[PDB]
Amino acid sequence: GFDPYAFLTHWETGEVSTLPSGQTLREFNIVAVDKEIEIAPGVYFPAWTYNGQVPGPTLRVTEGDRVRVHFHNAGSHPHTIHFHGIHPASMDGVPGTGPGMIYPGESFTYEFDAYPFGCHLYHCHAIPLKRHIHKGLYGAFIIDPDPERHPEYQAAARARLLGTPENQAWQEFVMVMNGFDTNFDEENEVYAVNTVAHAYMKRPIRIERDRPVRIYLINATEFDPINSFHLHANFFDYYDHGTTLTPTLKTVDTIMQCQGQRGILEFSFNGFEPGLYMFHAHQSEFAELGWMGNFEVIE
Amino acid sequence: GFDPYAFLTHWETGEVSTLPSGQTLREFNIVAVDKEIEIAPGVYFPAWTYNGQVPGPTLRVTEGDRVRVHFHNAGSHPHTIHFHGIHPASMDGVPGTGPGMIYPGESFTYEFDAYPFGCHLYHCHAIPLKRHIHKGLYGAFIIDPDPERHPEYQAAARARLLGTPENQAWQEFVMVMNGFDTNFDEENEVYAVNTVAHAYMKRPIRIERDRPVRIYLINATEFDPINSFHLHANFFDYYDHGTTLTPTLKTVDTIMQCQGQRGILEFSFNGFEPGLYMFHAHQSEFAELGWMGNFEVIE
Amino acid sequence: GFDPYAFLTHWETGEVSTLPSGQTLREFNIVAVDKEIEIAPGVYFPAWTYNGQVPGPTLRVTEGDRVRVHFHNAGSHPHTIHFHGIHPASMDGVPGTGPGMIYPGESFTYEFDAYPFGCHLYHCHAIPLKRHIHKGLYGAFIIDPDPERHPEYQAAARARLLGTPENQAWQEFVMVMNGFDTNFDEENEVYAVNTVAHAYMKRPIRIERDRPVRIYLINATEFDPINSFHLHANFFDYYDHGTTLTPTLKTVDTIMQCQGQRGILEFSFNGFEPGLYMFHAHQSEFAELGWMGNFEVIE
Amino acid sequence: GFDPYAFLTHWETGEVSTLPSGQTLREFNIVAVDKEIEIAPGVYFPAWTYNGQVPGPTLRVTEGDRVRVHFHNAGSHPHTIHFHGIHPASMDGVPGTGPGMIYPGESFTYEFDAYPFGCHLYHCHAIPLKRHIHKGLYGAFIIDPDPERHPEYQAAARARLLGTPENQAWQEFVMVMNGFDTNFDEENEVYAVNTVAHAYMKRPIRIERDRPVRIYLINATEFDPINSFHLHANFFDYYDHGTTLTPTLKTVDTIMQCQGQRGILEFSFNGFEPGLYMFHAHQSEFAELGWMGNFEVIE
Amino acid sequence: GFDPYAFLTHWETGEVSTLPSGQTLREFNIVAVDKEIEIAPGVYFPAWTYNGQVPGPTLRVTEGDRVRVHFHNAGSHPHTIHFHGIHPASMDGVPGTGPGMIYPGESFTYEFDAYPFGCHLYHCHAIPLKRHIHKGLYGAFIIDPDPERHPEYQAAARARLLGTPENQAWQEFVMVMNGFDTNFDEENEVYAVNTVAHAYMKRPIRIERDRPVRIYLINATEFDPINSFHLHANFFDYYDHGTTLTPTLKTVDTIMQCQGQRGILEFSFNGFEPGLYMFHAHQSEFAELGWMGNFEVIE
Amino acid sequence: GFDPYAFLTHWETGEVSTLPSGQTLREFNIVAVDKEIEIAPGVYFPAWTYNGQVPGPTLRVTEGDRVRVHFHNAGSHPHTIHFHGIHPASMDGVPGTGPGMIYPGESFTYEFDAYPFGCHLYHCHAIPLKRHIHKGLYGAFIIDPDPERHPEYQAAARARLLGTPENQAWQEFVMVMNGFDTNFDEENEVYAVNTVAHAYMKRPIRIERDRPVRIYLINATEFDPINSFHLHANFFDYYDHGTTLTPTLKTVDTIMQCQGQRGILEFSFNGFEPGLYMFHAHQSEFAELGWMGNFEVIE
Ligand SMILES: [Cu+2]
Ligand SMILES: [Cu+2]
Ligand SMILES: [Cu+2]
Ligand SMILES: [Cu+2]
Ligand SMILES: [Cu+2]
Ligand SMILES: [Cu+2]
Ligand SMILES: [Cu+2]
Ligand SMILES: [Cu+2]
Ligand SMILES: [Cu+2]
Ligand SMILES: [Cu+2]
Ligand SMILES: [Cu+2]
Ligand SMILES: [Cu+2]
Ligand SMILES: [Mg+2]
Ligand SMILES: [Mg+2]
Ligand SMILES: [Mg+2]
Ligand SMILES: [Mg+2]
Ligand SMILES: [Mg+2]
Ligand SMILES: [Mg+2]
C-alpha cells in the first residue's frame, strides 16, 4: 500500500478543535500493527508499523498547539512512541516512566504542548532499543513556527507555516533516510529515502524551477553510525534540527547526521538548465543499495 | 574502587601557589599504574590508569594559570600525557619530541600556561596509539575562562569559573563516553558514560529543576568512529570544545562527536514535571550495552 | 612518480585567456589513465587516475571564471568527472544525463562558471560509485573568492586570492585524506594524507613561525564513514566547505568530515617553540596505518 | 597473593632432621588447591596450584638427602607430583603405578634420595597431561651438589651449595618460563617468567655488578614447542639440566628449551656501565606478551 | 601386518660377501610399494612404504663396509632414497642429480662406502618433499664403528658392534618418532614411536635390570618443528647423531630433535625397583595422542 | 638491487684508522630506509632496511677493535640497532635506555669494543619487537678472533682472521635464514637463505673441492620457532655462536637454531665426486617455499 511519491508531500495535521482555554488542539490516531512492507518489488520485509506504513505518518502541527496522540497497540510485542520534543517525563514513551510500554491490546494518549518549533521525529523506545526502531517504528514530527511569536523573523516563520501564501510558494518535501537488514544480522542490506530503494530514480521528483525547495531530512537508519545527503550541481542552506530561523550552515552541498539527528535543507534551482539533478548519500555503498534519487527540474 | 557517582562532580584543582611573577601556579601529581577496574559487577578490565582510576582525574584550572603536571610511570609499559591544549612541542606528550615516552620508573613535569579556555582532555600517546587509549589512559581537562579577559561576556565567564556565586547556581557534571573491548579484538563489548555500564540507571543523577545544568562531555571511545548524546523530553545548547561563550548550536537534543571531540551542554528542567528523564547514545547498540542514564528531576 | 611533498603547494590554474564577453577563461586538460601508484615503498596499488597521479591535479580558479575541462578517457573502463560546484545538469558528470559516462577513447568538455567560492573537489561518478572513487579518481577544486564581489570582507577575500601580496603572506597547503583497500575486500589497509602513508613523518612540512597557515582539507576516504584532523598543541578556525569568509567553528583542535565533505583550516604557530607539531586522524587506527604527519615549525 | 619479586630468591629447604642411619632428611608439605592467580593486574586465571602459588614452591636440597614430600589433594580433580629426578617407579607420580593419582581428600608421601645434582622440576602428571600442567601444577626442584663427593670440582660444588661463604658471593635467581591460555583454546595469550607478565619491567631485578649471577631456568610453557632466553649486552655459560659442574655451552647469549628442559646460566656484569640490561625470549611474540624483564646493574 | 614389538630389535644386516679388494660388501633389496598401514586398531593410513612397512627396514652395517641398496619402485609416484651419510652426489637420492627420481617400474642401485659411524636414517626426497616423507618413506640406518679404526675408544666401539660379546650385554632398541595427518591438512592427528600409537603402553618393553640400555632415536615427524624424549625416574647420556664415542650431553632426562636429527641414548636401570618406567614426548599433546610408552623393568 | 650471490662473500670492514691509544678503529655508516625488496621475481615486499638491503650489511671486525656505527634514520618509523655482543646498556639499541629509539631524521653513533669473538648479528629492537625484525632490519656481525690473544689455538684463530694466508685457503660464506609474511598475518609465505627464494638453486654456489668451507649461519626467521640446516652427502662441525675455537658439535649433518641463534659450520668436499650437493632446512615446508640451495663442487 505504501506510496513513496505521495508520502513526500503528505502532512497529517490531525482533527483540529479549540480547547476551553482557546488553545488549538490537534488529535491523531496511531495504531501499531505488524505488517509486510515492500522495500523493492518482491523484497518483503516483516515490519512493525505505525498505521500500516513505514515511515509512520508525518505529523505536522504549529508551535503552541496542544497535541493528543491516541496510541493503540494492535501488534504482538509491547511498543511505545518516544517523541523528540519537549514533554513531561510521563509522556516520554520509555519503559521506565508513566504507563511504560503499551502492551498488545492496550491504549494510551500521549499529550503535550508542541515545543520547540523545528524538524523532529518519533520512534519506538522498547526493549531492545535497536530492534523496534529497525523493524519500522519511526516517523516525522514537524512543528511549524508561530509567526506571532517571532516578530524579528516574521518572513521566515510565515514561509514555514503550512498554508500561508508565502508557504505555498515553497516546494516542501519530507525525506526519512532508512535501511533494512533483511537477514537480521545487524547490517543493512537495503538503504533508501522513504523506504523504497531507488524510488526517486524510477520516478524523479518534479521541481518547478522558479520556486524554492525545502526538505525536512531525518536520519532513522539503524546499525550504521551516520548517513548523509549530497545535492548535485547546487548548494543548500542547512538548519540543524530546524530549531532556528537562520541557517546553521550556509552554502554547503554535503551534510551528515547520526541517527536521531535531522534538519531542514533549503535551496533553489532558479535559473538552472532543465534536467535531472541527483541527490544521494555520500557513503557510496548506501547510494548503490538504494539511497539515490533524482530531482526533475522543469522550466 | 572507582565511584562513578562521586566522579560526576569531582574537580581536581591542584596545589595552588603564586610564582614570583605573580602568576597563579597549579601543581598536579599523576602516576600511571596498571590496575584492574570494574566496568560492571563481576566484569574486570585490566586497565592502564592515571592515579588508579578510569577516567583519570578531572583537572580544572583557570585560563592563564601556569600548570605543572608531575608525571611518574609506575607501570610496565612506556606512557605519556598528551594534553588537548596550547603548549610547546617538547611538552606535547608524543614519542618523538621532548623527553619522548616516559618509561617505567621515570618522571617528567609537563608545564604550560592554561590556554585556550574551554572543555578539553588528555590521554596517552604511545605506541600503538589505540592500545594505550583503550586501556584507560584518558581524562578530562577543563580550563575555566578568566572573566577579567572577557568584558563583553562577563556573565557567561563568571557562570563557568569554579566557586563563583554565579557558578554555584549551576549544576555541573563531567561525562566521559568510553568503551571497553574485553576480549581485545578491537570491538567494544561494553559502553558507558564514566566507565560503569548503566551506572546512572541503577542510581539516577539528581537535578534540582529550578537550577540550570551544564555537562562537560568528552568522547574517549576507541574503535567506533562516533559517539552521541540524546537528551529526552528537552533541548540543550551546545558549545563545541567549550571554546566560545556563545553556543555553537542552539536548541538541539542529539549531538555527535568523534573521539577527541568534546564540548559543553547547557539546559534547564525548570517547570518540568518531576520524573526520570533519560540520556543516552543515539547509537542504539551503545545504549543497550551500558551508555544509558537517567536524570531524576525533583521539585 | 607521485611527489606528495610537491603536491602540497601545487596549484593548477590553467591556460588563461579572455572570452569575447570580457570574462576570464581557464582551460584544463584531464586524461583518465590506468597506472600503478606507490602508497608506501614496495606497496603498489592499481589505480585509475586523472593525469597519472592520485589525488588528481588540484585545480584552482577565481569565482566567476569560465572553466573548461577537456576530459579524455585513455583508460579501460568508462569514467566521468563529477564536480562539487554549481553547473548545469548536462555537465554534472553522472551516467544518466548529458553525454553520460565517457568510454575508452571518447572525449568531452565540461564547461561552467566557477561558483560558489570555497573549497571543493571532483571525482568519478560511474558504475559502481564506490569502485571508481576508491581506485583513485578524485582531486581538489578550489574557487578563490573575487574580492570585488565581497566588499564587506575584502581583506579575507584578498588573503585567499592566489597571487595577491596578502595571499603570499599565507602558507597554503592542500591535503586530501584518502585510503587504500589493497586486497579489494572493501576495507582500507592503508590510510594517508596525500596518498603516501606517513609521508610527512619521513619528511615534515616546514612552517615559518611568523606567517599564518591555511589548509584546504578534503575527505576522499571510501568505505569508512568519517575521517578527522587533530592538530597537536594548537587550535585552528574551521570553514566548512570554505564557502563563508568567516569561520564556521572558532578555536577547535579536532574536526571530522564524512566523504565528500571538506573545508579550510586556519591557524598560526606565531610565538611557539620551534620543533615538531604532529597532525593526524583522531581515529587511532587510521593514524597508525599512515594518516599522521608532522609540521616542523622553524624560527 | 603471589609475589614474583620474593619468588626469585626464595628457597624452601624443608624441616631438616637426621635419620637413625645418620642420613639427612628433608620434609616438605605440599597441598594441591584450586585458586585464582593474577597474571596481570585485572587478569584472573583459574589455577590448580601447589601451596596456593604458581609456580609451586621452589624446593632445594642437597645431593644424597632423603626427601619426603607429604602430598595432600585439597582440590576438585585428581592430581600427582611427578619429579624430574631419580626415584622408584612407585614414587614417579603417574597414574599407572604406586598409589596412582591422588584423589580429592587423599594423601601420599613421595620419598626418595636426592639424585642427581642439578636443576630440576616437578609437575602434575594426570589425565589429560597438558591440562594439569597448564593449569599451574609445576615448580622448581634444585639439588645442590655435595662437595665431598666431587673432589676434582670442590670450588664449583661449593659455589652452588646453599649457605656456603662461596655460595653467598653469588647472586642466585630461579626463573620459570610459563604461559597461560585464558580462553582455553590451547594457545597461550600471556607469557611470563614467574607468572606475572612484564613483572621485571615494572620492577627490574637489582644486580651488584661486582658479584656473579646464576639463574636456575626452567621451561614450563605448554602448547608452544620451545621457549628461550636472550641476555642483552652480555654472554653467559650454560649448564644443561645443571647436571655437570663444567658448562655445556661456553659464551652464548641465546639458548632454547622445550618444555621440561631446564638448566643453569652463569654470567657476570663486572666492569659494566650501570644501567638496565634486558632479558627476554627470542620468540618475539612471547616477549611482547609479557616474557621480558630488566636487570638493573648497579655500582 | 606391521609388528612394532619385533621392529624394536630387528636389524637388517644384508646379504654379505667379499669384494675382490677384500672389502666387505652388504647388499639390500628395497621396494617402494603403496600399502595400507594400521596406526591404531581401526585407523588405516594410506602409506607409501619401503618393503611394506613404516618405518622402513632398519639397515645396520659396519663403518667401511661397501653398501649396495637395489631400489625398485613398485608404487604409483616417483620416489628416491636419500641417505643421511657420506656418498657421491650421484647417489644422493634427489631429483636433480644422477638418475634423478625413480619412476614406477624403474630400478637403481645406490652404492657407497658406509661412513661415518653413528646413528643415521634414510627417506624419500621427491616432489613435494614433505608429502613423500609424511606418507611413510623413512627408516633407520645405523653404522657401527669399526673397533680397529678407533684404538683409543676400543671398548666403546666394541659395545656398539653388532654381535660382539660386549654388544650382547647391551639391550639395544630402535625408536622412530613419527606422526600421521589422517585428514591430510598438514597437521598430525596421531603421534607414536614406531608408528602404532600407545603400542608400548598396551605392551611395555621388558628391560632386565642388570644390563644397560641403548636407544637409537630418530625424529621423522613431519609438520611439527620438534619432537622430544623424556625418561621417567632416571637419566641418560645422549650422543648427538651417534657420531662420537663419548657423549654429547651427560646426565639428562629430556632431549629434543628437529626432523632429521637423531642420536643414541644410553642409560641403566641397575639397582632400580622393578615396575613400569614411562617414556614419552615432553610435548604433552603428542604424548596424549600416542607417543607414550612404558619400560617394564624386571629382576 | 640486492644480489644474493655477491652477498654471500661480501664483508664490510669499515673505514679503519688508529685511535690515540693505538687501538684499531673501524667506522660504519648505516641508514635505515623504507624500500621495496624482491624476494622472488615479481614478488615485492615492502621492507624496512639497513642501507637499502635485506639482510643488512655484513659487518666484520677483529676482536679488540673499537667499533663506531653511525646510525641515521631516514625511514618513517622509529628504529634502533641492537647488537648481539658485549657493550654498555646505553649502546644496547632498546627503547628504554640511552638515546632510546632513533626517530626519523635523527642520528646516533653506537660505539663499543668488539667482544667476544664469534658469529653474531644485529637487528632492530623497536615497538613492537616482531614487526621491525620481520620488516627486514637484521644483519650479520662477525668478530674474528685475534690470534695474539689465543696462543693455544693459534692455527684456528689465524684461519678465521680475514686476509691471512691461512684464511685465504678457506672458502667463507655468510647465510642468513629469513622469511616473509607477504599478507601480514604473522605466518611466513616465503622462506630463504639470504632473502631470495631458491636463489642457490637457480645458480648453485661454486665450491673448489680441495679447499675447506666455512659458513656463518644466522637465524633471523620470525614467527616460526626454529629453523635448520641439513647438508646433503657430507657432515660438518658446528661452533655454537662461533664463540669457541673448538667445535661444539663434531660430525653432524643437521642442526637447528631458534631466532637469534647462529654459529659457524666447517666442512670439506675434498675427495668428493664433482656435482651438485644440496643444503636446505629440514622443516620440509620451508625448503619447498624457498630455503633450499645447491653447492656446485668442482674439481
Ligand atoms: Cu516497539
Ligand atoms: Cu530518537
Ligand atoms: Cu601509555
Ligand atoms: Cu587526542
Ligand atoms: Cu570512473
Ligand atoms: Cu561527491
Ligand atoms: Cu593434576
Ligand atoms: Cu616433565
Ligand atoms: Cu617418494
Ligand atoms: Cu633428511
Ligand atoms: Cu625499527
Ligand atoms: Cu637478536
Ligand atoms: Mg543484514
Ligand atoms: Mg571485543
Ligand atoms: Mg582490505
Ligand atoms: Mg588461548
Ligand atoms: Mg590433520
Ligand atoms: Mg602470511
CSV table of N, CA, C and O in Angstrom, one decimal, chain C residues 48-92:
chain,number,residue,atom,x,y,z
C,48,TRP,N,43.1,3.9,-11.0
C,48,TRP,CA,42.6,4.7,-12.1
C,48,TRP,C,42.8,6.1,-11.7
C,48,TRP,O,42.5,6.6,-10.6
C,49,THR,N,43.5,6.9,-12.6
C,49,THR,CA,44.0,8.2,-12.2
C,49,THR,C,43.5,9.3,-13.2
C,49,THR,O,43.2,9.0,-14.3
C,50,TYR,N,43.5,10.5,-12.7
C,50,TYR,CA,43.5,11.7,-13.5
C,50,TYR,C,44.9,12.2,-13.7
C,50,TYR,O,45.5,12.6,-12.7
C,51,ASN,N,45.3,12.2,-14.9
C,51,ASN,CA,46.7,12.7,-15.3
C,51,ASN,C,47.8,12.0,-14.6
C,51,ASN,O,48.9,12.5,-14.4
C,52,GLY,N,47.6,10.7,-14.3
C,52,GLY,CA,48.7,9.9,-13.8
C,52,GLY,C,49.1,10.0,-12.4
C,52,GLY,O,50.1,9.5,-12.0
C,53,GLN,N,48.3,10.7,-11.5
C,53,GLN,CA,48.6,10.8,-10.1
C,53,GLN,C,47.3,10.7,-9.3
C,53,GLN,O,46.2,10.9,-9.8
C,54,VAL,N,47.5,10.3,-8.1
C,54,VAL,CA,46.4,10.3,-7.1
C,54,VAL,C,46.9,11.0,-5.8
C,54,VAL,O,47.9,10.7,-5.3
C,55,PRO,N,46.2,12.1,-5.4
C,55,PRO,CA,44.9,12.7,-6.0
C,55,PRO,C,45.2,13.3,-7.3
C,55,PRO,O,46.4,13.5,-7.6
C,56,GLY,N,44.2,13.5,-8.1
C,56,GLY,CA,44.3,14.2,-9.3
C,56,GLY,C,44.8,15.6,-9.1
C,56,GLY,O,45.0,16.1,-8.0
C,57,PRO,N,45.1,16.3,-10.2
C,57,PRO,CA,45.5,17.7,-10.2
C,57,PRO,C,44.6,18.6,-9.3
C,57,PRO,O,43.4,18.5,-9.4
C,58,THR,N,45.2,19.4,-8.5
C,58,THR,CA,44.5,20.5,-7.8
C,58,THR,C,44.2,21.6,-8.7
C,58,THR,O,45.2,22.3,-9.1
C,59,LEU,N,43.0,21.8,-9.1
C,59,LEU,CA,42.6,22.9,-10.0
C,59,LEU,C,42.1,24.1,-9.1
C,59,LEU,O,41.3,23.9,-8.2
C,60,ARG,N,42.6,25.3,-9.4
C,60,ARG,CA,42.4,26.5,-8.6
C,60,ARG,C,42.0,27.6,-9.6
C,60,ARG,O,42.8,28.0,-10.4
C,61,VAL,N,40.8,28.2,-9.4
C,61,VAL,CA,40.3,29.2,-10.2
C,61,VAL,C,39.8,30.4,-9.4
C,61,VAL,O,39.8,30.3,-8.1
C,62,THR,N,39.3,31.4,-10.0
C,62,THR,CA,38.6,32.5,-9.3
C,62,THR,C,37.1,32.5,-9.5
C,62,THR,O,36.6,32.2,-10.7
C,63,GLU,N,36.3,32.7,-8.5
C,63,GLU,CA,34.9,32.9,-8.6
C,63,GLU,C,34.5,33.7,-9.8
C,63,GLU,O,35.0,34.8,-10.1
C,64,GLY,N,33.6,33.2,-10.6
C,64,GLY,CA,33.1,33.9,-11.8
C,64,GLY,C,34.0,33.6,-13.1
C,64,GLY,O,33.6,34.0,-14.2
C,65,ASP,N,35.1,32.9,-12.9
C,65,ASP,CA,35.8,32.4,-14.1
C,65,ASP,C,34.9,31.5,-14.9
C,65,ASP,O,34.1,30.8,-14.4
C,66,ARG,N,35.1,31.5,-16.2
C,66,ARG,CA,34.6,30.4,-17.1
C,66,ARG,C,35.6,29.3,-17.1
C,66,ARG,O,36.8,29.5,-17.3
C,67,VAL,N,35.2,28.1,-16.8
C,67,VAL,CA,36.1,26.9,-16.7
C,67,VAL,C,35.7,25.9,-17.8
C,67,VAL,O,34.5,25.7,-18.0
C,68,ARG,N,36.7,25.4,-18.5
C,68,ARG,CA,36.5,24.4,-19.5
C,68,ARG,C,37.5,23.3,-19.1
C,68,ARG,O,38.7,23.5,-19.1
C,69,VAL,N,37.0,22.0,-18.9
C,69,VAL,CA,37.9,20.9,-18.6
C,69,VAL,C,37.7,19.9,-19.7
C,69,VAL,O,36.7,19.2,-19.8
C,70,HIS,N,38.7,19.9,-20.6
C,70,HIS,CA,38.7,18.9,-21.7
C,70,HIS,C,39.1,17.6,-21.1
C,70,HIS,O,40.3,17.4,-20.8
C,71,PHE,N,38.2,16.6,-21.1
C,71,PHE,CA,38.4,15.3,-20.4
C,71,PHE,C,38.5,14.3,-21.5
C,71,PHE,O,37.6,14.3,-22.4
C,72,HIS,N,39.5,13.5,-21.5
C,72,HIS,CA,39.7,12.4,-22.4
C,72,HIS,C,39.9,11.1,-21.6
C,72,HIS,O,40.5,11.1,-20.6
C,73,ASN,N,39.3,10.0,-22.0
C,73,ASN,CA,39.4,8.7,-21.3
C,73,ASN,C,40.3,7.8,-22.1
C,73,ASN,O,40.0,7.3,-23.1
C,74,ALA,N,41.6,7.7,-21.5
C,74,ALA,CA,42.5,6.7,-22.1
C,74,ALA,C,42.6,5.5,-21.2
C,74,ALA,O,43.6,4.7,-21.3
C,75,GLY,N,41.7,5.2,-20.4
C,75,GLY,CA,41.6,4.0,-19.5
C,75,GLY,C,40.9,2.9,-20.2
C,75,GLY,O,40.7,2.9,-21.5
C,76,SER,N,40.5,1.9,-19.4
C,76,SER,CA,39.8,0.7,-19.9
C,76,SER,C,38.4,0.6,-19.5
C,76,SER,O,37.7,-0.3,-20.1
C,77,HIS,N,37.9,1.4,-18.6
C,77,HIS,CA,36.5,1.5,-18.2
C,77,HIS,C,36.0,2.8,-18.4
C,77,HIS,O,36.7,3.8,-18.6
C,78,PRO,N,34.6,3.0,-18.5
C,78,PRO,CA,34.1,4.3,-18.6
C,78,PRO,C,34.3,5.1,-17.3
C,78,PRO,O,34.3,4.6,-16.2
C,79,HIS,N,34.4,6.5,-17.5
C,79,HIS,CA,34.6,7.3,-16.4
C,79,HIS,C,33.9,8.7,-16.6
C,79,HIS,O,33.4,9.0,-17.7
C,80,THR,N,33.8,9.5,-15.5
C,80,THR,CA,33.4,10.9,-15.7
C,80,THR,C,34.2,11.7,-14.8
C,80,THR,O,35.1,11.3,-14.1
C,81,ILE,N,33.9,13.0,-14.8
C,81,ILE,CA,34.3,13.9,-13.7
C,81,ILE,C,33.0,14.6,-13.2
C,81,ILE,O,32.3,15.3,-14.0
C,82,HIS,N,32.7,14.3,-12.0
C,82,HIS,CA,31.6,15.0,-11.2
C,82,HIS,C,32.3,16.0,-10.4
C,82,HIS,O,33.0,15.7,-9.4
C,83,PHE,N,32.0,17.3,-10.6
C,83,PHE,CA,32.4,18.4,-9.8
C,83,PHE,C,31.4,18.7,-8.7
C,83,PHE,O,30.2,18.6,-8.9
C,84,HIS,N,32.0,18.9,-7.5
C,84,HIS,CA,31.2,19.6,-6.4
C,84,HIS,C,31.3,21.1,-6.7
C,84,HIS,O,32.4,21.7,-6.6
C,85,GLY,N,30.2,21.7,-7.2
C,85,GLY,CA,30.1,23.0,-7.7
C,85,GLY,C,28.8,23.2,-8.4
C,85,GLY,O,28.0,22.3,-8.6
C,86,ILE,N,28.5,24.5,-8.7
C,86,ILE,CA,27.3,24.8,-9.4
C,86,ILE,C,27.5,24.7,-10.9
C,86,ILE,O,28.5,25.3,-11.4
C,87,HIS,N,26.7,23.9,-11.6
C,87,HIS,CA,26.8,23.7,-13.0
C,87,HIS,C,25.5,23.1,-13.6
C,87,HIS,O,24.6,22.7,-12.8
C,88,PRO,N,25.3,23.1,-14.9
C,88,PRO,CA,24.1,22.5,-15.5
C,88,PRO,C,24.1,21.0,-15.3
C,88,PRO,O,25.1,20.4,-15.1
C,89,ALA,N,22.9,20.5,-15.3
C,89,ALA,CA,22.7,19.0,-15.2
C,89,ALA,C,23.5,18.3,-16.3
C,89,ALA,O,24.0,17.2,-16.0
C,90,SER,N,23.6,18.8,-17.5
C,90,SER,CA,24.3,18.2,-18.6
C,90,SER,C,25.8,18.1,-18.3
C,90,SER,O,26.5,17.4,-19.0
C,91,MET,N,26.3,18.9,-17.4
C,91,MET,CA,27.7,19.0,-17.1
C,91,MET,C,28.0,18.3,-15.7
C,91,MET,O,29.2,18.5,-15.2
C,92,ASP,N,27.1,17.6,-15.1
C,92,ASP,CA,27.2,17.0,-13.8
C,92,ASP,C,28.1,15.8,-13.7
C,92,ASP,O,28.4,15.3,-12.6
